[PDB]
Amino acid sequence: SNLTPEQQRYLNAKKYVKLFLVADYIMYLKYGRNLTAVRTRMYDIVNVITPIYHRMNIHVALVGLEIWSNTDKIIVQSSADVTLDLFAKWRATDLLSRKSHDNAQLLTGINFNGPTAGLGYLGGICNTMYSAGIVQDHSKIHHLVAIAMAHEMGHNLGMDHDKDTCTCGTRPCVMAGALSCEASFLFSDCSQKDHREFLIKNMPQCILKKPLKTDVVSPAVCGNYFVEVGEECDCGSPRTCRDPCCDATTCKLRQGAQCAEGLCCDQCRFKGAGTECRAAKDECDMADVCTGRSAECTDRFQRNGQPCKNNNGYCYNGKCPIMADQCIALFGPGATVSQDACFQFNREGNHYGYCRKEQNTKIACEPQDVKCGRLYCFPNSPENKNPCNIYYSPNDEDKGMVLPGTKCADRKACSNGQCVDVTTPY
Template structure:
């Protein structure tokens, strides 16, 4: 038993993180004042991917990466029996510890110091820690303004929103602990690794209601020295970490997002920072988190907040009027600008809306691929909902299985069934090759089609960086079509437009982020200038209007309107032109400079497609409807080696979106 605010003994034995003896299901009782609570836990299968590695360093700087071969881990999710809406997120690695929430109250369960099998349960308000805000103190974002604007195609947008939100997103996450964190945890390598996984377990619990799963693909501990400069300046530390991630971590470890857990106390009151709308990008998909609490829960809440910024979520400021299901005195919602007592663990209506709009714009293009779990660190088990090695299907426990194609007891297909799961499985049979299974989400995305050989929709692909957007005057960058016009709407609302040609010579972005004068060729990559729109910026009370009357060569004057918006150091100023925005024919803004799209290598990639297709982000040709990959030089069914064929046999009317190519003369060759 475990008693609140006191000592108690437990008959439970915890064999350690590396043991195989952690049960799949665990029940235990807690005596809380006059209540006896029964906690039901199930091991969080799928938390840790098959590619999961643990990395640390030798004294000479050599990195050591280990792959776990365990059949079970020690991280659990669950609930309090008999209490609707209750949650539990605990670990049993070396002892029982974690959080339990019921009746709008959150409690921390921890082992007693210097006691064997003795535990304490106390309100989260009593937890020791350092509290403060995210690096952004005032954030009413560009996305909040966009919420009021109808999309170009209402019907398409509604359909795509339903499909995108319905699909589970998987964030393949790496968590890194810096050297100061290693020291603060007693230089105990296993303790630090365990703490990082426990943080991920909590974050996964927070994001599940949004249909987002956190899949840990790696933890890394800088036990010798920091691999980049980490200081008390959070802004500098963030950019140092993001640069290290891009240059060092990404080439050796495939992942979607990386977060640094730091033992350094950042200056001021900042406890975390992350760029907004940066998920899946090589440059900025990550953040930094100060480990500000004795419990891993503190860092988990901050990490969830910074990850929210990566997803495009902004702070829940009063002026946004966000709906939160938890009262402020009970913790409020995760995207509150400042973290305090108790911990927030849910997302607000504003966060959900921000997420919807980000996904519609193409943010998070890498998240729709199911990570490999056939050799899951979580262990194999028929009934856990994951199709693992040796299983034909898995629809959960027999009492909860609703799949008509799968035998829940044996995890095998029923007679005459060919498949049981996947977007390309219907009525227990494979859909024909060429059946659309994932529509393009924006002008830079490509659709995917069933292959006829697999029940699963192919992994998401999109247009190569530097490709012309489909139907929009711009260029693709990280799967999104950035335009000046779109950014002017974001800043000033409907009714805005760009200054006439020639106005840029008088100061369209006349200064970059630094104080030096920007060359004329780079003018469109600094502060964006707009005309018209609302009387003041629509993105919040902290936006400052910068207006300039510009004389035109042909006579007359125009009013150019720029803005400066303070969102804090961790969020970019939306008054600056976004990277990837078209600045001239064949050129885009990169690092505040107008650069040729040739830097992306898109022209070389397109050349191999024989003018009958486009190039995707994997540098493969996506062919028109009547030409075959990989080079669109032979008759076929279109598509790419990544996306599947774009039409079925006998169909002649489908084309690559925006291609407009003509079908070849003669009959197509059927693939074998």
């Protein structure tokens, strides 16, 4: 109704925050130079964060853990602001290059100036440079440090501080503005809305990808609604378990059953081979089918080259990359594709107008490949007086270039800066 079938579908999807935790040098000393103790402290903290976020339809999964026992990798300091900035930066150039994860939190033993015990970018979830938070190991009671960490992840997820009239009960909520040991594990009604709205407007993609059981480095917990190595199923505690196929007490399948949760499981048995589990969502998707022996249902799409969106594009890995949609994504609503003559600028091989790079040398487009180099857009309005406009980033010169798989002519799409036949496998 108010939400597109895309938004609606995104909201109903199960969310997962693949968390990476870091403990600083002071944490290592604080716990007696006992990596076993530091690690344990971190597990206990995640064991508290997880149930807190389950009430927000998000499963927090520790997919990575690092302890700077040898020395800090960033300049951890009294200023929370500077530390956050340095941690996020380090996360972007160092950590994200060797370990994929949706969010990172720094647990430090230092004392931040002021009464705050943490800091996090508001709405930075999934962002390559802002999905981060830092937390002070401010109390001996670990469930209070977990709440502080949950609070920062709260901001990361688009939530603000609870204001005078927000409530979750008789006690303070996770997003309360200040500390207290009366802190509960519940989110206020306001946080619920903020978060929901944030998702509606931003739909961060990374939290839809479920972590592999083998990617979780935290000791398995039976009853946390996530199947971890050593478990066959997990429907929660024996009191909340609604899955007849699973014995919530042992996290083992109940005699007979072959599976429990999933699109390819019926009455505790593998759906029939060739049975449809997930229908196609769009003209570039292909109905998914069960294999009979598996419990999960692999997702497959149409073969690249399938005409889509009223002969305006060709399917590419599940999507329908169109030049009109790209212009809108770069310059906002109203943006239209520039007239053909504008693309001639790509034959220049100049600083912005080219088709590809050999290594660092920009190679001008061929007369026939003009539509596969730099994208030229025109914000359609009475004002603007320039038919040709480009989007450029000094950080990544590839940004603003026509996307691969984009229709560049009849029966042709861009491959590697070249307009080629969609009938040839790509």
